[PDB]
Write a protein that binds this ligand. Structure first.
Ligand SMILES: Nc1ncnc2c1ncn2[C@@H]1O[C@H](COP(=O)(O)OP(=O)(O)OP(=O)(O)O)[C@@H](O)[C@H]1O
Ligand SMILES: [Mg+2]
Lengths: 386, 290, 96
């Protein structure tokens, strides 16, 4: 049998399976069924359905171990199930696919393909398989795996392309996301983008690049451009000390020696952290440049991969240079705090004795910020290092 | 009384409360009720329900000040209310909690806990309390406060962990977000991450750090690395001027004096903006370190 | 009438046209064209707001949004907060 309505049914201790729907049935409606099964010999389900396309609402029972068994799944306190195109709380809508819905939406919102949906939106369309549009207006999704959120006049027309808080904007890249933007058209793969009329910033997930059209800023009050150096013998060198090199490693600078910088605690920009992985995890040429292979992913993504170093051991638990003792942030350029002696004057230059500034030939003393005292054995001056 | 169906009812000037459901009632169904209340002496509600678990659809009326009062709340133009597990416009589904739903979804989408939901997705599972999965495939959420959007083979298994436009990826950090990524496993707390096979960029909300595996670029045509300096006497020094220092402050450079730089209008990278707060808002040591 | 509440608990409210709440507890939207999902103690009150996977989060300006945010407020025009705790934000076209 098929095409049957079962509504407003009460079962008082009647049937181990209360309502039962067989295999291959396309169209059944079950509403308002309530059963009692205390006095039944081994009751199973109040409602039972072998396939998933009967429609069900208003189920309650006492004494049945399962209120609903549908397509081999218990819904122990009942189910509300509708099949086909769905629409709730909307004023008007265009096309709705059987696996699409429109909710809380106005003026011709449309979800025309499988797994496409529109929420709380006006005049928005999706023909994207696996997609969501929400909190939006004049918007369209037409690729696949698209989400559009809190957006006006926004288009996502490529796979995994997405827009959040965007106006008059189009995301056309593979895995391409636009945020907090007005009037931008975007195309990169694995890119996060923002802009006003033109693209203004980019987070490139593919190559690991960060781009700003204008400035990048970091740091506080007096800051510097810095680089990680390794200390000779693995010593700790405190901040404010002038360092030199010996056997490729840093130590406190002595008389007549070249000052390469100052141990720094206030870098805005730093190089050579190895924050992600161990430094030798990737193959590098003789100049330190990464060696690559061109890979074309099964899908179609055409990228280049850094070559793995065979000597790399994924067992070894990586501790970054920022946590190691021997590795020091050394300020190379900028306004830097330096340990001085009694001989150092504002507006003058400095040489070094035991890593401590003495009157000399290098750089410029900007201002003494902590005057020398016999008891401390040093003062502190801001030195403009270049 | 309990377990009652009220359907296809028309009230022509009959009852101040049209349909009334008392306290402690678990199971009532109300469909297709239409009332007229012009000629009633002080009508209140077409439908009235003291608790929230009767189910309601197809309500209309004229002359009633409230079409529906449910659990002390007016729904003045009617309500459509279902309770329990919900499913609409989907081909198949696994487990659905009474406070879970599956919509516009295919092949065994499951929402097994309170406040878990799946939209427009295939073979996706959430057991995350307070979560959403949408526009997705082969995906799983299992922490709390997880959203997964436009994603394939994506896992969120920590609190507030989230993924948008991500492939074959896992976010395991506290408040940890992955964007526009393929094949990355992520763990930091208050981190935003992107990558292809390996993590390639990070926005650290916790410590205020920005990290790129490759390059950071800024600026235009001819650019420079720069720093904020304060002018002696508070003068304005125009761009293109060579500056020196005197009493820790900049002025135009003179003969034989040390040139420290040029007033710049085209910096790509700059230090010491104090863009966020006043410079002295935080305690610093003798070397300027926080 | 153009709002909904689904998979939600304790007094979730969607009081305006095109406002909706999903899988959330004690969350309110009075934002026209908005969504709150996977959330708790949260409120949207501007326009074009989405709040996702958030606790004690407020969006009270147009296109302001929060994802994976705690005890946080986005008040800027097209202003987005990510992966954050205890921040109040105000810039226009900013991600914070
Ligand atoms: N061959 C390796 N494979 C994987 N990890 C490694 C390897 N060698 C070292 N590490 C990791 O790097 C950390 C210390 O680095 P180590 O000094 O041993 O080598 P390195 O190449 O000198 O590193 P760095 O130059 O960063 O100091 C350790 O925590 C260890 O886990
Ligand atoms: Mg080493």
């Amino acid at each position: 049998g098929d095409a049957v309505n079962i509504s407003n049914v009460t079962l008082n201790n009647s049937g181990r399976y209360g309502v039962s729907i067989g295999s291959g049935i396309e169209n059944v409606s079950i509403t308002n069924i309530s059963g009692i099964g205390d006095g039944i010999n081994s009751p199973v389900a109040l409602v039972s359905t072998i396939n998933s396309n009967p429609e069900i609402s208003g189920l309650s029972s006492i004494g049945y171990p399962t209120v609903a068994r549908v397509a081999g799944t218990d819904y122990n306190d009942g189910l509300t199930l509708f099949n086909g195109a769905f629409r709730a709380s909307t004023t008007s809508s265009g096309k709705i696919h059987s696996e699409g819905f429109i909710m809380g939406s106005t003026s011709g919102c449309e979800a025309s393909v499988s797994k496409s949906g529109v929420l709380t939106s006006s005049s928005s369309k999706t023909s994207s398989e696996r997609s969501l549009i929400a909190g939006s207006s004049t918007s369209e999704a037409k690729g696949t795996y698209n989400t559009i959120l809190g957006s006006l006049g926004a288009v996502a027309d490529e796979q995994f392309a997405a827009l959040i808080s965007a106006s008059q904007s189009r995301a056309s890249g593979n895995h391409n996301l636009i945020l907090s933007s007005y009037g931008i058209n975007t195309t990169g793969s694995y890119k996060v983008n923002g802009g006003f009329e033109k693209i203004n910033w980019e987070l490139d997930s593919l190559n690991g690049r960060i781009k700003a059209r204008d400035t990048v800023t970091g740091g506080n009050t007096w800051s510097d451009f810095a680089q990680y150096f390794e200390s000779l013998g693995g010593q700790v060198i405190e901040t404010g000390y002038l360092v030199t090199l010996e056997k490729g490693k840093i130590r406190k600078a002595e008389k007549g020696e070249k000052i390469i910088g100052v141990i720094s605690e206030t870098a805005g920009f730093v190089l050579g952290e190895s924050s992600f992985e161990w430094q030798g995890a990737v193959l590098k040429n003789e100049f330190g440049g990464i060696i690559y292979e061109e890979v074309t992913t099964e899908d179609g993504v055409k990228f280049k991969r850094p070559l793995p170093n065979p000597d790399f051991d994924p067992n070894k638990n990586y501790i970054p240079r920022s946590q190691r003792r021997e590795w020091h942030v050394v300020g190379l350029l900028g306004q830097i705090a330096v340990r001085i002696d009694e001989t150092v004057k504002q507006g003058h230059s400095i040489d070094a004795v035991g890593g401590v500034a003495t009157d000399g030939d290098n750089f410029i003393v900007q201002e003494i910020t902590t005057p020398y005292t016999k008891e401390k054995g040093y003062g502190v001056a801001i030195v403009l290092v270049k």
